[PDB]
Amino acid sequence: STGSATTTPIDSLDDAYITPVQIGTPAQTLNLDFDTGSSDLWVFSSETTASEVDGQTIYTPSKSTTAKLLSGATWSISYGDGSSSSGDVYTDTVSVGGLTVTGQAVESAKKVSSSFTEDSTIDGLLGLAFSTLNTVSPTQQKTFFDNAKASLDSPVFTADLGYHAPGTYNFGFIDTTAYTGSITYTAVSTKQGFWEWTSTGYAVGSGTFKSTSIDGIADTGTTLLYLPATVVSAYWAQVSGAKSSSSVGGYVFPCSATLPSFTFGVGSARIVIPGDYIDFGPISTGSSSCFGGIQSSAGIGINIFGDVALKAAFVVFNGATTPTLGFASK
Numbered sequence: 001s002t003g004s005a006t007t008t009p010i011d012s013l014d015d016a017y018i019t020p021v022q023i024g025t026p027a028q029t030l031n032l033d034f035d036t037g038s039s040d041l042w043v044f045s046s047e048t049t050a051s052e053v054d055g056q057t058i059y060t061p062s063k064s065t066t067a068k069l070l071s072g073a074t075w076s077i078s079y080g081d082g083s084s085s086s087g088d089v090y091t092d093t094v095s096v097g098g099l100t101v102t103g104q105a106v107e108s109a110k111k112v113s114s115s116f117t118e119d120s121t122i123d124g125l126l127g128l129a130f131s132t133l134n135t136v137s138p139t140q141q142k143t144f145f146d147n148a149k150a151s152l153d154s155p156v157f158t159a160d161l162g163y164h165a166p167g168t169y170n171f172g173f174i175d176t177t178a179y180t181g182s183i184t185y186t187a188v189s190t191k192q193g194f195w196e197w198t199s200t201g202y203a204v205g206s207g208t209f210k211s212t213s214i215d216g217i218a219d220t221g222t223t224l225l226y227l228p229a230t231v232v233s234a235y236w237a238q239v240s241g242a243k244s245s246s247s248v249g250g251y252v253f254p255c256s257a258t259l260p261s262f263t264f265g266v267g268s269a270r271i272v273i274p275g276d277y278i279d280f281g282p283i284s285t286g287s288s289s290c291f292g293g294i295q296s297s298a299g300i301g302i303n304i305f306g307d308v309a310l311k312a313a314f315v316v317f318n319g320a321t322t323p324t325l326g327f328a329s330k
């Protein structure tokens with residue numbers, strides 16, 4: 001089998017992407033944030049604390065004839081941006097772009113933190129990291145991909161995120177019309193439960209390529225590109241007036257600037273992130289100070305190839321017995 005669904009930016013900055021997902025019988029369609037950096041499929045629901053729901057579409061398991069309470073199971077998760085959610089668990093039928101999994105763990109939120117409430121466009125998350133990170137207790141649950149894998153034509157999914165435009169998540173096949181040139185594959189470590197890989201280096205604008213190993217994760221659920229302070233300083237040094245602002249929480253730059261591109265290595269191949277992709281707009285409405293899309297990972301403990309990087313590429317998440325990652329230009 002295969003599946004194919006369109007993924008759409010939630011706002012004009014590409015802060016995140018939402019993909020429609022059918023849950024239950026009859027289907028209840030929720031718009032979920034597909035997140036290759038976590039492993040829980042959780043949704044706003046009829047069980048979510050009422051004051052914490054503000055415009056989201058909710059899953060109501062009592063209206064699904066295929067929903068079953070997973071007795072005794074709870075979940076609780078904290079994300080890298082300081083947000084969190086928690087609740088109980090149902091199994092139900094979940095379909096993405098025509099690909100159906102029966103008995104998928106659908107984690108129903110009883111509580112969500114403020115930044116989830118305040119974002120009306122995201123109805124929950126669909127985790128696509130390794131199932132070893134799944135938070136369900138006392139019996140850990142499998143991701144949608146893990147459950148689907150055996151049935152897929154090929155045990156892969158692909159992320160093709162758009163810049164200020166829709167894109168595509170495919171399951172079970174590689175769309176050879178969706179990228180240019182060849183896909184370069186690179187080794188993955190699953191030891192931390194992430195799609196963790198090692199970039200071979202970087203360049204800033206038309207500058208020379210620096211060969212240097214950068215270990216990091218391919219994370220569709222993080223907006224920005226987080227890299228070592230040395231790399232990030234080298235990038236922003238090429239932008240007049242750019243500076244790291246402790247008060248704002250990262251590098252900012254004059255909105256009048258023209259940003260240079262940033263290139264990252266995948267083996268001997270090169271992915272070029274256009275300068276425009278690195279502009280996250282005014283820090284506050286009407287400001288002429290703009291927020292940068294490349295930021296230091298120093299305070300995080302891991303480098304993160306988030307949407308800023310991934311949207312410059314066609315990305316293959318190869319879930320074969322030995323997983324790998326593939327990147328192509330597009």
Ligand SMILES: CNCc1nccn1C
Nearest residue numbers: 033079081083115116122
């Ligand atoms: C904005 N913070 C919550 C959130 N929304 C999508 C992902 N995450 C972690």
